[PDB]
């Protein structure tokens, strides 16, 4: 019942190979809906989900112009950052940022976000109050002082509490048949002998959306956290996700083990066992 919109910016310098490349992707929950790449032949914001295609040409022109302006802004930011850390012009560096809003079942703002990272390390972040900044080091304090002087936080606040929430609610309605549809996991347990002495039990969850899920193994009703191998949730390529959890069990003790599945799409949490 709760939802998020997020935009993700990445800028990567490449001395001797042109100017820094800029990429943006936009998500609603776990669904990518828009992209931009400055290395594209004719850079434009492009749709990646059917429900955003209905936006008109004025939408796409504004979104494209924002991304083209951001391409230049992030290139200046990267030049400033190089100086803040006394770095050579010879190295490649990365600047990332994410911003957006979370909304509850009633469509009201839960919280907003805007944070940045330099070379994979947190750099500066807007606090949950949408009024103050947390700077990671003395370089980020330079940015902070400059954004405090320009009252940047007030602009973000106005955006995150207004436009961000209102456009998220628009997208959720326009794409309600998918964005507000939870697809439950299809679940089964497989058995893989290792030796005469033990075998793997693997609990599968396939075809689910959104990606959030809980998969756990219990032995005699106690959780086997330290003994469970859990793979990262992975995209199937058809909007849905996959995950599995595995435990190594002594031969003949299989019925002491239970797999447990929680997902938004399930009428009730599942309890599964090996069924030879």
């Amino acid at each position: 019942g709760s939802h998020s919109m997020r935009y993700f910016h990445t800028s990567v310098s490449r001395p001797g190979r042109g100017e820094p490349r800029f990429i943006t992707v936009g998500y609603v929950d776990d669904t990518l809906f828009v992209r931009f790449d400055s290395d594209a032949t004719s850079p434009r914001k492009e749709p990646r989900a059917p429900w955003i295609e209905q936006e008109g040409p004025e939408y796409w022109d504004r979104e494209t112009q924002i991304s083209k302006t951001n391409t230049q802004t992030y290139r200046e930011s990267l030049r400033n950052l190089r100086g803040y850390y006394n770095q050579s012009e010879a190295g490649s560096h990365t600047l990332q940022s994410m911003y957006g809003c979370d909304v509850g079942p009633d469509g009201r703002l839960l919280r907003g976000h805007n944070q940045y990272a330099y070379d994979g390390k947190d750099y500066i972040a807007l606090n949950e109050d949408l009024r103050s900044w947390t700077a990671a080091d003395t370089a980020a304090q330079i940015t902070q002082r400059k954004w405090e002087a320009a009252r940047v936080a007030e602009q973000l606040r106005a955006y995150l509490e207004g436009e961000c929430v209102e456009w998220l609610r628009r997208y959720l309605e326009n794409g309600k048949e998918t964005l507000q549809r939870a697809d439950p996991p299809k679940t089964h347990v497989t058995h893989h002998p290792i030796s005469d002495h033990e075998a793997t039990l693997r609990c599968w969850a396939l075809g689910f959306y959104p990606a959030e899920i809980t998969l756990t193994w219990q032995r005699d009703g106690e959780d086997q956290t330290q003994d469970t191998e859990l793979v990262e949730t992975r995209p199937a390529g058809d909007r849905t996700f996959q995950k599995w959890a595995a435990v190594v069990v002594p031969s003949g003790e299989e019925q002491r083990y239970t797999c447990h599945v929680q997902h938004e799409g399930l009428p009730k949490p599942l309890t599964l066992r090996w069924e030879p």
Binding site: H9, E63, I66, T69, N70, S77, Y116, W147
Partner: peptide, 9 residues
């Protein structure tokens, strides 16, 4: 839709 005033760091 995106925020239109991303600032320089």
């Amino acid at each position: 839709r995106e925020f239109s005033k991303e600032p320089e760091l």
